[PDB]
Amino acid sequence: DKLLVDVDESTLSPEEQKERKIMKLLLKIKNGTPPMRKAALRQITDKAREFGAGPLFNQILPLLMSPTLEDQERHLLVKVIDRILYKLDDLVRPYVHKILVVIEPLLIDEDYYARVEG
């Protein structure tokens, strides 16, 4: 919802909130043309440690909890969560239990590739 209104970046003095804003590039990852997807994915992989775990997961996991998740969207989000996991190495220690609480269902599901991913 935040992305609907607009406000200047400096006025977004909570520069972590600036971070959140620009993080909602997630939407571009979710819906968007293949080039949007690629560029966004590179963006996030390399700005990962710059962003930090807290924001990233606090704004990812709600998505994965969506009842209205389709297939593509899901496998996309797991792609990203994987790539950022490969950058943030330790910083996840506070966030493990959250990560499991969401990934676990992939362990028991009729899709094959979903099982192997999770």
List contacts with another protein (CB under 8 A).
71-72, 75, 79, 113, 116-117
Could you give the CA distance from residue 69 to residue 105 in angstroms, rounded to a whole number? 13
* Cβ 4 to RNA shortest distance, Å: 27
* Minimum CB distance to RNA smaller for 32 or for 118: 32
CB–CB of 39/22 below 8 Å?
A: no
* Minimum CB distance to another protein smaller for 62 or for 113: 113
Interface with RNA includes 47 (CB under 7 A)? no
Among 12, 26, 39, 41, binds RNA (CB under 7 A): 41
Could you give the CA distance from residue 38 to residue 114 in angstroms, rounded to a whole number? 21
